Amino acid sequence: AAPKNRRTIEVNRCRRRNPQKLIKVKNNIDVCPECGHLKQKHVLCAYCYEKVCKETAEIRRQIGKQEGGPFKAPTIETVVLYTGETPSEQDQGKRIIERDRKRPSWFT
């Protein structure tokens, strides 16, 4: 079926500009308690998540160096160490990954 008449700009402005089509203001937004970079409630802060994913990426690169090739996947717990930081006695059999940094003041 085809239009019988050209819709004017008055009818079009009445359609495409009503509150059902406008963008709704959201108010879930506040500052993150650490780093102040404006998260959303019920959502992890993208800055802090970027921090954690960068450090996790470097740990996974060191794991991939220590495991040699694929299909290796050891049968022991792992644990990471930074510079200094002698292995505790409770982490005896656990795999030791040490990269090189100071231990950051959120990973304890």
Partner 1 sequence: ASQLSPTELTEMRNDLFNKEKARQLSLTPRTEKIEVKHVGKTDPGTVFVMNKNISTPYSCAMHLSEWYCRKSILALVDGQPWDMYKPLTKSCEIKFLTFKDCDPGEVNKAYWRSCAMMMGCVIERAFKDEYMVNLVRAPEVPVISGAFCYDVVLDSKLDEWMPTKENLRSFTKDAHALIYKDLPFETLEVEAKVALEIFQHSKYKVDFIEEKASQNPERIVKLHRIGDFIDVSEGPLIPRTSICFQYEVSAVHNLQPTQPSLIRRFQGVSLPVHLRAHFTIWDKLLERSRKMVTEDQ
Partner 2 sequence: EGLIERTERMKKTMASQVSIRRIKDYDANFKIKDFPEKAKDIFIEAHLCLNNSDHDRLHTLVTEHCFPDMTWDIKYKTVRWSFVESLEPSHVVQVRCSSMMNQGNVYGQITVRMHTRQTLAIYDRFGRLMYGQEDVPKDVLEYVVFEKQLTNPYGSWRMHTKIVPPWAPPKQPILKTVMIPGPQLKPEEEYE
Partner 3 sequence: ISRKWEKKNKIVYPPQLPGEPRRPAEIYHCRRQIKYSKDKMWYLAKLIRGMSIDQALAQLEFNDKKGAKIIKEVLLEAQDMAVRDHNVEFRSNLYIAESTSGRGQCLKRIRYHGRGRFGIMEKVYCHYFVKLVEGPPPPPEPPKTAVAHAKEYIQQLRSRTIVHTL
Residue positions in the annotated binding site for Zn(2+)? 32, 35, 45, 48
Q: Which residues, other chains included, contact 83 with Cβ-Cβ below 8 Å and sequence gap of 6+?
A: 98, 100, 101, 102
Q: Which of residues 1-20 bind partner 3 (CB under 8 A)?
A: 16-17
Q: Tell me, what amino acid is at 90?
A: Q
Pick the closer one to partner 2 by CB: 59 or 66: 59
Closest listed residue to residue 39, CA positions, set 24, 28, 52: 28
Cα–Cα distance measured from residue 9 to residue 33, given in angstroms and rounded to the nearest whole number? 48
Q: Which of residues 9-38 bind partner 1 (CB under 8 A)?
A: 30-31, 33-36, 38
The stretch near partner 3 (CB under 8 A) out of 25-33, 48-56, 74-82, 98-106 is 25-33
Q: Which residues, other chains included, contact 60 with Cβ-Cβ below 8 Å and sequence gap of 6+?
A: none
The least CB distance from residue 52 to partner 1, in Å, is 18
Verify binding: residue 66, Zn ion, rule CB under 5 A. Answer: no
Q: Which of 23, 57, 73, 76 binds partner 3 (CB under 8 A)?
A: 23
Verify binding: residue 65, partner 2, rule CB under 8 A. Answer: no
